[PDB]
Amino acid sequence: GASGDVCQDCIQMVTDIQTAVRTNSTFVQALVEHVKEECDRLGGMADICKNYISQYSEIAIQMMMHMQPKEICALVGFCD
Amino acid sequence: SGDVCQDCIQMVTDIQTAVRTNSTFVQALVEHVKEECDRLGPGMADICKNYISQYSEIAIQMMMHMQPKEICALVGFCD
Numbered sequence: 001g002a003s004g005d006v007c008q009d010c011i012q013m014v015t016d017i018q019t020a021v022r023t024n025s026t027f028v029q030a031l032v033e034h035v036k037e038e039c040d041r042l043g044g045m046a047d048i049c050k051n052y053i054s055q056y057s058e059i060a061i062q063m064m065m066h067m068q069p070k071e072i073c074a075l076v077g078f079c080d
Numbered sequence: 081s082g083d084v085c086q087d088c089i090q091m092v093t094d095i096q097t098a099v100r101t102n103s104t105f106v107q108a109l110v111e112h113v114k115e116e117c118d119r120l121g122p123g124m125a126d127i128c129k130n131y132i133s134q135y136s137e138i139a140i141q142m143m144m145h146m147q148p149k150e151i152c153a154l155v156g157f158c159d
C-alpha cells in the first residue's frame with residue numbers, strides 16, 4: 001500500500017545519497033551550508049541552530065554512512 | 081545529485097498520498113519519532129519529545145500545502 005511505497009522510495013533515496021557522499025566532493029558541503037541558511041526560519045534562535053549543525057554535521061554524516069539504507073529509513077519511521 | 085532530487089520528489093509525492101489515504105500514517109510517524117528521542121539520553125529526551133509535540137502539527141500542515149519540489153528544495157536535496 002501507500003506506506004510500503006514510501007518505505008521503498010526512502011531506501012532508493014538514501015542509497016543514492018550514500019553514492020553521492022562517496023562520489024560527489026561538493027554534495028555534503030552544499031547540503032550542510034543550505035541547512036545552516038534554513039536556520040533563520042526559526043524565530044529557537046538561528047545562530048544557536050547554525051552552531052548545532054556546525055559541530056554535529058561530520059559525525060552525523062559518518063554515522064549515517066556506516067548504516068544500511070533500510071536502517072536509516074526505519075530510524076526516521078518511513079520503514080516498518 | 082539529480083538522482084537524489086528525483087528520489088526526494090518521488091518519496092514526498094508518495095508521503096502526501098499516504099497522508100491523504102491512510103488515516104493512521106501521520107499519528108504513527110509522530111509517535112515513532114518521539115520514541116527515537118530516547119537514543120539521546122534521559123534529560124535531552126523529554127526536551128526532544130516536547131519539541132516534536134509542539135512543532136509536528138505545523139510541520140505536517142506546511143508539508144501538505146507545499147509541492148514536493150518545494151519541500152525537496154527546502155531540505156536541500158533539489159537545486
Ligand SMILES: O=C1C(O)=C([C@H]2CC[C@H](c3ccc(Cl)cc3)CC2)C(=O)c2ccccc21
Nearest residue numbers: 060063064067068071072074075076116119
Ligand atoms: O531493528 C534494528 C535497528 O533498528 C537497528 C538500528 C541501527 C542504528 C540506527 C541509528 C539511529 C540513530 C543513530 Cl544517531 C545512529 C544509528 C537505529 C536502528 C539495529 O542496529 C539492529 C541490529 C540488529 C537487529 C535489528 C536492528
